Amino acid sequence: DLVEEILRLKEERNAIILAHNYQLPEVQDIADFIGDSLELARRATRVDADVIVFAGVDFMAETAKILNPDKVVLIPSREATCAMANMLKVEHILEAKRKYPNAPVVLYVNSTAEAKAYADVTVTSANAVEVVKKLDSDVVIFGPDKNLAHYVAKMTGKKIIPVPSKGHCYVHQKFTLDDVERAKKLHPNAKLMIHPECIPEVQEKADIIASTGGMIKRACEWDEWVVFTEREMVYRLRKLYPQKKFYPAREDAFCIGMKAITLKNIYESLKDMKYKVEVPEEIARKARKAIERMLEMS
Ligand SMILES: O=CC[C@H](O)N[C@@](O)(CC(=O)O)C(=O)O
Numbered sequence: 001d002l003v004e005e006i007l008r009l010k011e012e013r014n015a016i017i018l019a020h021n022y023q024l025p026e027v028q029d030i031a032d033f034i035g036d037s038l039e040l041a042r043r044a045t046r047v048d049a050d051v052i053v054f055a056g057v058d059f060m061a062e063t064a065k066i067l068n069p070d071k072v073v074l075i076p077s078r079e080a081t082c083a084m085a086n087m088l089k090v091e092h093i094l095e096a097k098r099k100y101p102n103a104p105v106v107l108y109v110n111s112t113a114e115a116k117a118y119a120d121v122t123v124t125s126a127n128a129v130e131v132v133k134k135l136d137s138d139v140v141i142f143g144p145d146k147n148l149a150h151y152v153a154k155m156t157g158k159k160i161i162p163v164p165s166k167g168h169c170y171v172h173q174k175f176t177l178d179d180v181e182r183a184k185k186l187h188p189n190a191k192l193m194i195h196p197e198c199i200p201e202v203q204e205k206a207d208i209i210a211s212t213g214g215m216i217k218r219a220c221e222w223d224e225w226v227v228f229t230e231r232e233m234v235y236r237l238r239k240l241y242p243q244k245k246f247y248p249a250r251e252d253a254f255c256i257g258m259k260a261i262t263l264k265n266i267y268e269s270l271k272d273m274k275y276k277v278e279v280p281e282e283i284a285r286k287a288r289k290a291i292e293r294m295l296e297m298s
């Protein structure tokens with residue numbers, strides 16, 4: 001029914017469905033590509049599809065449009081939003097730049113297109129340390145996540161100015177040391193894979209620090225993992241590695257923005273060609289330049 005209807009319209013629209021790793025299992029199951037936001041945007045550049053339906057949040061659909069300006073990019077819900085990315089206002093960047101005019105501005109790929117337009121370079125979780133160590137400055141402005149900034153500071157020794165100072169992801173901030181201790185109590189043979197958006201005392205307990213793309217790449221290093229990220233990641237890992245064991249660190253670690261996406265509104269997205277994601281031409285050019293620079297440095 002709904003699934004066959006989506007496939008019919010996907011075919012008719014010359015569309016591809018890109019689903020983030022935190023998407024509901026039934027959404028991942030009908031997606032053409034599944035991964036993190038940068039992986040998804042880059043996968044779409046492989047084909048001349050006319051339409052992208054982005055099963056994910058606002059900034060990720062923007063990144064797809066930045067790297068695929070020739071595609072119509074749809075987001076099924078205007079309530080699929082990232083709380084962390086939207087804490088960062090342009091004024092935050094400008095104030096830090098005014099104070100430290102020789103410091104490069106680095107934006108985590110989890111950020112608005114508009115923020116990327118003020119960046120000298122973007123970073124992923126996997127390359128942030130290498131890229132920031134390579135930047136030609138001992139002081140770096142970095143946003144929007146203060147916990148990832150703290151991790152980068154510890155690993156590079158550089159002076160990292162987080163913008164905004166309090167920027168963070170509520171989904172990952174809620175993991176505590178109590179959750180680490182419960183994980184080890186219940187699963188003593190497991191290792192801990194921990195997203196760098198978790199708080200520093202939780203990062204310190206990690207066996208690996210990785211965002212979702214790196215969790216998939218490094219899961220080969222052990223056969224049993226407790227997963228410190230949004231709980232739907234556990235479904236993706238179990239599907240890719242059915243011989244291993246994966247446990248959520250907390251079942252109630254959910255991203256409300258990701259849960260705005262449903263099969264029903266993916267269908268309505270295709271039927272009505274909504275909601276079209278718009279990125280201003282000069283913002284996209286400036287954001288593209290920062291993303292391409294990141295690839296040069298990695
Ligand atoms: O930083 C990786 C980009 C990605 O699209 N978002 C994630 O960070 C998860 C998140 O949204 O916090 C990921 O690792 O999948």
Ligand code: SF4
Pocket residue numbers: 057081082083084085110169170171172230255256257258
């Ligand atoms: S999990 Fe956090 S950072 Fe990732 S999309 Fe949801 S709110 Fe944004």
